[PDB]
Amino acid sequence: GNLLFLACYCIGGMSA
Amino acid sequence: TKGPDAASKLPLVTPHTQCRLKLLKLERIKDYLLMEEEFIRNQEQMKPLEEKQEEERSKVDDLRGTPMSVGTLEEIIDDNHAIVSTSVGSEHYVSILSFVDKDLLEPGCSVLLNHKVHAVIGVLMDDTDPLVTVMKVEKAPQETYADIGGLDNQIQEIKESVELPLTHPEYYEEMGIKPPKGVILYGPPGTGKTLLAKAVANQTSATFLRVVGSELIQKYLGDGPKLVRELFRVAEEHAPSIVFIDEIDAIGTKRYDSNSGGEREIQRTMLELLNQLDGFDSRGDVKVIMATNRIETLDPALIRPGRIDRKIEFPLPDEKTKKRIFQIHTSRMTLADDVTLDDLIMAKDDLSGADIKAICTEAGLMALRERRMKVTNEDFKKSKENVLYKTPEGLYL
Amino acid sequence: SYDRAITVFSPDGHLFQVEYAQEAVKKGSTAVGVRGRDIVVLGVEKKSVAKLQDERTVRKICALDDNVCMAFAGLTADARIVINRARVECQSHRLTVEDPVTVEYITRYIASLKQRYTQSNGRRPFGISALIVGFDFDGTPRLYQTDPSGTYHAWKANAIGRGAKSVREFLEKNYTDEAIETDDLTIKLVIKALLEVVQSGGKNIELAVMRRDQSLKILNPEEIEKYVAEIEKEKEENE
Amino acid sequence: FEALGIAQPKGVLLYGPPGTGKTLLARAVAHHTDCTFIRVSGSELVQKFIGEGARMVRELFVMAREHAPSIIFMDEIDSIGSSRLEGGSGGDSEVQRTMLELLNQLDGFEATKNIKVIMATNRIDILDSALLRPGRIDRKIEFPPPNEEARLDILKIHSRKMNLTRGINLRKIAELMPGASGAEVKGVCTEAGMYALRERRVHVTQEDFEMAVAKVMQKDSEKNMSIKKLWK
Amino acid sequence: KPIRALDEGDIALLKTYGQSTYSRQIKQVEDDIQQLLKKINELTGIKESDTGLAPPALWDLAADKQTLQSEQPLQVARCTKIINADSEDPKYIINVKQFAKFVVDLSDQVAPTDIEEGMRVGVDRNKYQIHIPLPPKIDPTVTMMQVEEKPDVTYSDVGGCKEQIEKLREVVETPLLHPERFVNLGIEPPKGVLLFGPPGTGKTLCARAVANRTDACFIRVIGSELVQKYVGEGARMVRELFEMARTKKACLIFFDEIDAIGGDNEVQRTMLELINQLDGFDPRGNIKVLMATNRPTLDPALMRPGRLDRKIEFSLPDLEGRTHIFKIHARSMSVERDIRFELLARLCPNSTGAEIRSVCTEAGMFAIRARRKIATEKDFLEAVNKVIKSTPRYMTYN
Amino acid sequence: TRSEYDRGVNTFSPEGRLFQVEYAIEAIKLGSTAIGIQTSEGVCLAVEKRITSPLMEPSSIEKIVEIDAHIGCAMSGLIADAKTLIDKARVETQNHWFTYNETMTVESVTQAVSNLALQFGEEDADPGAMSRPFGVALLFGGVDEKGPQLFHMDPSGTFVQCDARAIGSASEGAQSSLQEVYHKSMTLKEAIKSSLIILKQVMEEKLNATNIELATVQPGQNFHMFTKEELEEVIKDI
Amino acid sequence: RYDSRTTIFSPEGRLYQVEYAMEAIGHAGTCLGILANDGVLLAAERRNIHKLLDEVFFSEKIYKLNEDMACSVAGITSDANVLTNELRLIAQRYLLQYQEPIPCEQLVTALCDIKQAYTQFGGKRPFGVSLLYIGWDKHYGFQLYQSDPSGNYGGWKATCIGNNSAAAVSMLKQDYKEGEMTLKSALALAIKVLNKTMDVSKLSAEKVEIATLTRENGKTVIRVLKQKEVEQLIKKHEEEEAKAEREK
Amino acid sequence: CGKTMLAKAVAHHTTAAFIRVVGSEFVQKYLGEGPRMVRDVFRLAKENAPAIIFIDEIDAIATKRFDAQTGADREVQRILLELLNQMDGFDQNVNVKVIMATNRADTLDPALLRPGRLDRKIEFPLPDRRQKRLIFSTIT
Numbered sequence A: 001g002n003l004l005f006l007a008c009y010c011i012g013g014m015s016a
Numbered sequence B: 001t002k003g004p005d006a007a008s009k010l011p012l013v014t015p016h017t018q019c020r021l022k023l024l025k026l027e028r029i030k031d032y033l034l035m036e037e038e039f040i041r042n043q044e045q046m047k048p049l050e051e052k053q054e055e056e057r058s059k060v061d062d063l064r065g066t067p068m069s070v071g072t073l074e075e076i077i078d079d080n081h082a083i084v085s086t087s088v089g090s091e092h093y094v095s096i097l098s099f100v101d102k103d104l105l106e107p108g109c110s111v112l113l114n115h116k117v118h119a120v121i122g123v124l125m126d127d128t129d130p131l132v133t134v135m136k137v138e139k140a141p142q143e144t145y146a147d148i149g150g151l152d153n154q155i156q157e158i159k160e161s162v163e164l165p166l167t168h169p170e171y172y173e174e175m176g177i178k179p180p181k182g183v184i185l186y187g188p189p190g191t192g193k194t195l196l197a198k199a200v201a202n203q204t205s206a207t208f209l210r211v212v213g214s215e216l217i218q219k220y221l222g223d224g225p226k227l228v229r230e231l232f233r234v235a236e237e238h239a240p241s242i243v244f245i246d247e248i249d250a251i252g253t254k255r256y257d258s259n260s261g262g263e264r265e266i267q268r269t270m271l272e273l274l275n276q277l278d279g280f281d282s283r284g285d286v287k288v289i290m291a292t293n294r295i296e297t298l299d300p301a302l303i304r305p306g307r308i309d310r311k312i313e314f315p316l317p318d319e320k321t322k323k324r325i326f327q328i329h330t331s332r333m334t335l336a337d338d339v340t341l342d343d344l345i346m347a348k349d350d351l352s353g354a355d356i357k358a359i360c361t362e363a364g365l366m367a368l369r370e371r372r373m374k375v376t377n378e379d380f381k382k383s384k385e386n387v388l389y390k391t392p393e394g395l396y397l
Numbered sequence C: 001s002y003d004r005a006i007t008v009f010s011p012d013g014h015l016f017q018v019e020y021a022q023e024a025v026k027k028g029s030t031a032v033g034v035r036g037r038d039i040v041v042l043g044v045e046k047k048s049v050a051k052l053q054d055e056r057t058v059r060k061i062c063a064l065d066d067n068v069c070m071a072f073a074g075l076t077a078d079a080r081i082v083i084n085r086a087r088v089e090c091q092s093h094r095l096t097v098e099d100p101v102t103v104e105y106i107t108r109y110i111a112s113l114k115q116r117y118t119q120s121n122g123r124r125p126f127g128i129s130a131l132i133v134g135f136d137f138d139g140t141p142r143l144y145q146t147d148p149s150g151t152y153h154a155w156k157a158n159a160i161g162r163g164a165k166s167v168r169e170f171l172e173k174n175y176t177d178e179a180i181e182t183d184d185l186t187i188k189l190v191i192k193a194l195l196e197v198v199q200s201g202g203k204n205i206e207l208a209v210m211r212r213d214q215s216l217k218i219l220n221p222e223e224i225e226k227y228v229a230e231i232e233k234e235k236e237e238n239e
Numbered sequence D: 001f002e003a004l005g006i007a008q009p010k011g012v013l014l015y016g017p018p019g020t021g022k023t024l025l026a027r028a029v030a031h032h033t034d035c036t037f038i039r040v041s042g043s044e045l046v047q048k049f050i051g052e053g054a055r056m057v058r059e060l061f062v063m064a065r066e067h068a069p070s071i072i073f074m075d076e077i078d079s080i081g082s083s084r085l086e087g088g089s090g091g092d093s094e095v096q097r098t099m100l101e102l103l104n105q106l107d108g109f110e111a112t113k114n115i116k117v118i119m120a121t122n123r124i125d126i127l128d129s130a131l132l133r134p135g136r137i138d139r140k141i142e143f144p145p146p147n148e149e150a151r152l153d154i155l156k157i158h159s160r161k162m163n164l165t166r167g168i169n170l171r172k173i174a175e176l177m178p179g180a181s182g183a184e185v186k187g188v189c190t191e192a193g194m195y196a197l198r199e200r201r202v203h204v205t206q207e208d209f210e211m212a213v214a215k216v217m218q219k220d221s222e223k224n225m226s227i228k229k230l231w232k
Numbered sequence E: 001k002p003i004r005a006l007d008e009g010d011i012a013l014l015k016t017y018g019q020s021t022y023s024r025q026i027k028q029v030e031d032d033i034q035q036l037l038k039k040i041n042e043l044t045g046i047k048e049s050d051t052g053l054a055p056p057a058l059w060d061l062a063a064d065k066q067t068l069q070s071e072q073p074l075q076v077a078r079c080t081k082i083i084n085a086d087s088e089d090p091k092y093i094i095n096v097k098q099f100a101k102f103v104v105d106l107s108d109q110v111a112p113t114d115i116e117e118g119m120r121v122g123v124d125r126n127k128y129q130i131h132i133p134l135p136p137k138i139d140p141t142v143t144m145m146q147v148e149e150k151p152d153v154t155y156s157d158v159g160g161c162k163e164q165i166e167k168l169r170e171v172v173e174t175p176l177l178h179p180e181r182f183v184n185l186g187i188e189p190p191k192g193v194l195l196f197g198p199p200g201t202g203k204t205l206c207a208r209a210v211a212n213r214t215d216a217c218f219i220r221v222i223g224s225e226l227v228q229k230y231v232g233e234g235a236r237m238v239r240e241l242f243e244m245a246r247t248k249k250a251c252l253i254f255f256d257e258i259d260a261i262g263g264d265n266e267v268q269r270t271m272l273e274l275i276n277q278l279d280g281f282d283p284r285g286n287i288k289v290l291m292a293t294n295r296p297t298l299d300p301a302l303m304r305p306g307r308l309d310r311k312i313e314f315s316l317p318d319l320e321g322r323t324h325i326f327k328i329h330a331r332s333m334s335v336e337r338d339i340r341f342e343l344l345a346r347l348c349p350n351s352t353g354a355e356i357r358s359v360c361t362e363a364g365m366f367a368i369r370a371r372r373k374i375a376t377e378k379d380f381l382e383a384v385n386k387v388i389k390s391t392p393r394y395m396t397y398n
Numbered sequence F: 001t002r003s004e005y006d007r008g009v010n011t012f013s014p015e016g017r018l019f020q021v022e023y024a025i026e027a028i029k030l031g032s033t034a035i036g037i038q039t040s041e042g043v044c045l046a047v048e049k050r051i052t053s054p055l056m057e058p059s060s061i062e063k064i065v066e067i068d069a070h071i072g073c074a075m076s077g078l079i080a081d082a083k084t085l086i087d088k089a090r091v092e093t094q095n096h097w098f099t100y101n102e103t104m105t106v107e108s109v110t111q112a113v114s115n116l117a118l119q120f121g122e123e124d125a126d127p128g129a130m131s132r133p134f135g136v137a138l139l140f141g142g143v144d145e146k147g148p149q150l151f152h153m154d155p156s157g158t159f160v161q162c163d164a165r166a167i168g169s170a171s172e173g174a175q176s177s178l179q180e181v182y183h184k185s186m187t188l189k190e191a192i193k194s195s196l197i198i199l200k201q202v203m204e205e206k207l208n209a210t211n212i213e214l215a216t217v218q219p220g221q222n223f224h225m226f227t228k229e230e231l232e233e234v235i236k237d238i
Numbered sequence G: 001r002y003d004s005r006t007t008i009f010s011p012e013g014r015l016y017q018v019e020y021a022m023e024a025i026g027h028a029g030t031c032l033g034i035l036a037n038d039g040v041l042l043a044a045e046r047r048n049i050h051k052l053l054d055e056v057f058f059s060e061k062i063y064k065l066n067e068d069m070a071c072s073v074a075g076i077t078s079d080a081n082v083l084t085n086e087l088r089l090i091a092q093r094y095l096l097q098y099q100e101p102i103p104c105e106q107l108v109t110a111l112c113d114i115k116q117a118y119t120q121f122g123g124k125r126p127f128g129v130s131l132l133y134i135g136w137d138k139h140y141g142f143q144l145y146q147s148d149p150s151g152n153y154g155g156w157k158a159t160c161i162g163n164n165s166a167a168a169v170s171m172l173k174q175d176y177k178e179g180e181m182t183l184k185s186a187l188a189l190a191i192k193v194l195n196k197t198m199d200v201s202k203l204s205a206e207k208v209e210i211a212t213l214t215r216e217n218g219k220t221v222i223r224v225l226k227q228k229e230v231e232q233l234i235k236k237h238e239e240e241e242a243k244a245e246r247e248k
Numbered sequence H: 001c002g003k004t005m006l007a008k009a010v011a012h013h014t015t016a017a018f019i020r021v022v023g024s025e026f027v028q029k030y031l032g033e034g035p036r037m038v039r040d041v042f043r044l045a046k047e048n049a050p051a052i053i054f055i056d057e058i059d060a061i062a063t064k065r066f067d068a069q070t071g072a073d074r075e076v077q078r079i080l081l082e083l084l085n086q087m088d089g090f091d092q093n094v095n096v097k098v099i100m101a102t103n104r105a106d107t108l109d110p111a112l113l114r115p116g117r118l119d120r121k122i123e124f125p126l127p128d129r130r131q132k133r134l135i136f137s138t139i140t
């Protein structure tokens, strides 16, 4: 219940 | 396939009192290194050999162009077209030129492509991105089983897991038991897990890959699983090999429903590691070694009998193992005749190999404090409580 | 869960509170008892007093009566309470029967008392293991380890407390019929057993020897040094 | 160290109550060393992007190795390396990944050379056992609150630039500080200077220091005598 | 007592006096050895670095250049909703991977019948016209698959699941090999069955066992494979799989660890494709599906009646079952012929079958430890002591 | 969620089961196996020792005890619990011999021990008694007016007349083996041979003098345990 | 976890409620007892003297209980009063039954059974009190015992319990030369201990409570030092300190 | 009692660059963004002229440190630790005065309540008689 979790971040490079 | 790696020089370590037996052996080694240097400098001094084919190679290079981008051959189609992914992550349906080795094309191997109008123009069997090249051990660690005190059962188990299949394995298939694919060492910190891995990497006959666990995780999307795949592909390619992943709990924690993108990527990387662990047969000559302190926090799927059969325990050293470690680390010290070292061991505590090494180092420092190098017993007496920081007295009696 | 309840069986069928009480003994001190042909000896690891503790009131070895002695491992207060109860009960037994209390009866009484303390909530188990020794009226050497599960077992030479396993295996590799032929042989055996865990020697060791009804006197700190001198002499003699 | 046969000590931890000289000692070490001092104070290694903390740890140690024998100061190491938490869900794992990378660089397969590292914390007890382990952290130096003499010295350094008056007894002021940290002593010097400034003077007197001690060391006590008299 | 820091004279005298006479020579020699080692390492070079150049006379460099100057590359993409073309709105929105998504039209070389939602398509780079559908192909070489037609596991190789194997027999053998009784009974044969239990109970091989005795090919599909890198196309994959299931005379389709799927855009696509394949294919067929899981996370839309007719719980093996497994795994190793496997099965309460196999492996390990070509009962005793249990039970219970 | 009901003996499962007493039943398997066989000529009890140290005195481990000359006991479970049960059994036998000056049926012995059992959830525990189910399974053998009689007692208080019953760690396998071994025409010597064979194929270690305790009851003689020479004699044939 | 009622056992075997009872004594007033050659003295800290306490008392931290027995207490006030009352009851019950003054060891032991039974069972919190008993008996002359909230006890010649007790005991054992200190030297050493263990630049006689037990004329006298006595002794101590610091 | 108003006045009557922040603003979603914001704020103040950082409701992040057993509490304590190390850490700041207001000072971490970090802990009690008259006059 008392979770309150943070968040990471994984970007994905994109181009052509 | 190719062969293993991790070349090392002579053990030496037969004398240590610096009695010119060391000097003679080291001079022999230095003489051989000098003949190395002179021989190769002479061979480069005269070695005229070039051109020959030239024209055909020149025109094939013109066809390839410059630069040439490398990608991953994700899939193949009829034997003129394939699917190749650039390092960015985009993959394209490209054509395959005649001068490529159609036998070499397999899903995964790096393919040299044309910069413009992408088309498979070569195959690179030695991609080995700088990270995974780093994880491959080149210089064997100087530690060895002589330096390990105690842990005789642990050494026996690790050798029965990673050495006996490497050496004569006929006992295994003779009993019909499949060799133990993967082994996890565990125990309280500073018991000797990483030291045992070093000793294995010393007395070895296979490519040793050192990994950190947390090293596998990478920022970019899909970079993590791709790096894990590259590591295990290098392991298979240079088989037999040993893949040591220290601190497996950096990723080995219990799997839970991911919410953010980063946690999903971590789950993907661990899923890829588990898939790669399942991918190769146990009959294969590639083994893994994973060490950790918090064994209880690992996912109970990584340690399944179908994935990691063995589970080596590294308990805190016993009194006899404590005295063994003390003897080992005091070998290079010039201890006096008054020292006994028995009082420190007899004291009921939780000394570890790291703790004993630090006690020896601090005893040496205390001796240096008194301008001496013979190290009395009082030096150890002080050092023990110097480094051992931190039941209510008479409650239990 | 199933651990915080003295009288609740675990799904696999364990009384985890009693097991924890059993384990609480292992955090005490090493106490070994060896029964000889005409002697019973008890060696207890003595904690070193820093500078001020009065050793006259740190008793790790005590006698329930003239014909029974005992060593304990566990928390001191529990040992004192059970000692008082058992010695009062010995006097009550002599009230009932007038003959000196045998080892088996007092051991069974202690075990039953511990069991009754380990059978209901609101009563904490006696976290202490006691090696009782003694001669009967006919002077048979008997020794019993009593366990906080409220039980007892007749050992010829047992060890309890921290390092109990090491001393136990030392005795198993060392206990022989000829080793109890004389009192000094049993003394050598018990001194070696104590030195196996307490490597300091000299002090930190307390010895009690009971012969055929002399109301045993604890070994004063003068002749035990002689005994370890003999042990060292033998050790240097064989090699 | 080679001749003695000992292994070269690698890490040292400075732990103590909040404000005793730990960061001050690190600053002094940086000032009086020829090594390439590195300030990597905690929570700088916690990046939003995944796995970036471990990568930055690896780059930090590689870059320290590339330079001369280096010193790395991990101020407030309590931030990233505290204790590995069981499982995930709400538990922290990326910070633990960074901490594990730091542990491995400190004492892992590679056995770095001449990378002496200093860490500081106000709470040593909660640090991970795998981080406080000797060989990774040796000489867990404690910085206790200064005693009367040491308080006198601290007053004399922090009163060196003041304009004192003849008849000042800094020893009495130091005696007026039962169990006061060095930071509190510097604050007392500052408050005495403030008291002098209020009256638009430049010298400071003994009474200025006395009321500065009263103000700085003032703390709320247990108002309820009934609560305070529970214990004998 | 204030300790004195070492002074310059102190340091200078420390490095001498109490030194071995050969300190300088030995240290210098070791330094030159290391320097020469680095010298050799830097000078030895790299070598090839031999690119994938085919042997000559296989080269059509003229035609290669012609293709380079004529043919064009195509980025692949996952085609999405058809936008209800009906020959007047043939545009579809396609997602080129981590790149963007574009609404595009077809090339003249492909008919709309070849293009449908969720298939990989190769397209050009400026008009992004879908130039060629790219089916992901089916082959056991890629990923893992059924890779089995007649499994080598027979009814004698399974133990501890007598009630479970009986239930499985009623599930698969009775409708497949005895369709007449179901037909004249006028009852639809069981369309769906689920096999739930803890991992390592044996579940998979049990089905494989009946797969050998049902005279039908066994299919192994791993849910993690559907959810790992082989996601997306996996639907089409199972499509083709289900398609080949139609081709064969009888297929024992079974999905391993469906928990990875049962509990996610492409994952949902694979799920709905499974729903279409099951609810769409005629229940009278002969490709009956076997379902198993470890976590009874299954979506409520699945076990609605008509999709999963029966449920079977695979509990931990019993004394007879555990001893049967012990004997089965001992059949493949060199042991004596007087091993009390009942004793060991007693010594392994609530032990999984995989645990039993590991116990036999550790028994062989201990036999190897003593270099004895025949494992003994003592070896199995130490093996069970090690694996199982990962004074208390002897000083109170007797 | 079973967990809400295993806490306390006075709780009912949704299936109306007694999880606490079932756990007490499982607690028997922690003890060593005891085998009792009943035949026309008498009843014999064979028990293992499960010795921990060679120094352990054999007499101290009491896997078979005699309530009375005519009746013998075997127990499997908590040793202190077993000793309390056995002392109550001897006290109740002496009580019957006081009131009626006669030796009771072993059925009555199991009756009275059962009333000592199954008292955990009784208000009569106010002065002090078991608040938990008893943790030992019992095996009574004897010879009464009904000839030889063997009974098996469950910790819940259940008693059953048995021609042969094995309890303890290896109860299931030993019982299964006896099911085929047992014939109603068993002689005492062949019964004891079969029991020792069952022990051999059930025991963890080799059968020597110091692993098996053995007791016999026949209408002629009293309860008799095999002395060292007697057990050597009964072990040399096997 | 295993922090519930005292009739619980941690898997590591520790008695957590008992442990907290032991540890909570560090919140109580600092008091030590020492045994000179010819006396036993108990010194204690008057932690709470705000401005307006009547001081209508003969001693607060020191409770005499017998013509031979005096005690000092550190812990909860209620448990302190209860323990003192039970102490007087037991000592005088022994006197009534045996017509001889209660031996030191027997009395300390009796309190220890009380405390143990109060943590052995009953579902009741243990006494969070530590005692220092000073007395005389014809068996071992002058004796001093230190008790424990758990129910253990030990004979000691010098012992400090309460806040900052560990450092006080350390410096006490550093400055103890057994068998050769008179009551005067013992008092001076105790005052040094107090000065070092208090958070004051100069301890006050008001904050200090010292009671001395001596044997003379065949009788044991237990007397608390009057304010004049303690002030003279503390001024002698401070002038001695002045001489010592001038000599350095 | 006048805390945020006194801060408002100080911001009005100053030539310094004023950085108004609130404690709850520091606690960001993404891991490590909170400490990064703290570092950014102090770096901006350092790189600018003599500046003032006013952090209203400092007890949002600076409550007494404890054995955090989850990611959220660990991140909040990381923010607090970054604040400490920025205020009085290795690289000392010059002409950067911070002001922090709280309603419950007794719950603040002692590392934040020590000289060098928070030199003056000014109490703002309820108006007392004369102060009440001044308030009534200046609002009337």
Ligand SMILES: Nc1ncnc2c1ncn2[C@@H]1O[C@H](COP(=O)(O)OP(=O)(O)OP(=O)(O)O)[C@@H](O)[C@H]1O
Pocket: B147, B148, B149, B150, B151, B188, B189, B190, B191, B192, B193, B194, B195, B196, B291, B292, B293, B325, B328, B352, B353, B354, B355, B357, D107, D108, D130, D135
């Ligand atoms: N048995 C041993 N004999 C000698 N030295 C030992 C032994 N065990 C540990 N050590 C010493 O401990 C040091 C650190 O050990 P190691 O790196 O293997 O730790 P670990 O147990 O793997 O712990 P962690 O993974 O938690 O860092 C080694 O460099 C070695 O000198």
Ligand SMILES: Nc1ncnc2c1ncn2[C@@H]1O[C@H](COP(=O)(O)OP(=O)(O)OP(=O)(O)O)[C@@H](O)[C@H]1O
Pocket: D017, D018, D019, D020, D021, D022, D023, D024, D025, D120, D121, D122, D143, D146, D154, D157, D181, D182, D183, D184, D186, H084, H088, H089, H111, H115, H116
């Ligand atoms: N012993 C001391 N001698 C001189 N100055 C001191 C001493 N102790 C503290 N100070 C001064 O008081 C302040 C203490 O802050 P500092 O960060 O150096 O201490 P710390 O113990 O490292 O604290 P923190 O726990 O915040 O890291 C500094 O301004 C420093 O100059």
Ligand SMILES: Nc1ncnc2c1ncn2[C@@H]1O[C@H](COP(=O)(O)OP(=O)(O)O)[C@@H](O)[C@H]1O
Pocket: E157, E158, E159, E160, E161, E198, E199, E200, E201, E202, E203, E204, E205, E206, E325, E328, E329, E352, E353, E354, E355, E357
């Ligand atoms: N009934 C059984 N018969 C034979 N072997 C079994 C049985 N149950 C389990 N096993 C053993 O367990 C191991 C793993 O079983 P597996 O089918 O992989 O488990 P799961 O059902 O979780 O997939 C197999 O190697 C097999 O030897």
Ligand SMILES: Nc1ncnc2c1ncn2[C@@H]1O[C@H](COP(=O)(O)OP(=O)(O)O)[C@@H](O)[C@H]1O
Pocket: H001, H002, H003, H004, H005, H006, H101, H135, H138, H139
């Ligand atoms: N000393 C004062 N002079 C004038 N107005 C005041 C004073 N103190 C409080 N006020 C009134 O009360 C409010 C005080 O807000 P403030 O005290 O800054 O909130 P906080 O204390 O929560 O920061 C102001 O809006 C103002 O209207």
Ligand SMILES: [Mg+2]
Pocket: B189, B190, B191, B192, B193, B194, B195
């Ligand atoms: Mg390690």
Ligand SMILES: [Mg+2]
Pocket: D022, D023, D024, D075, H085, H088, H089, H090
């Ligand atoms: Mg600091």
Ligand SMILES: [Mg+2]
Pocket: H003, H004, H056
């Ligand atoms: Mg406000």
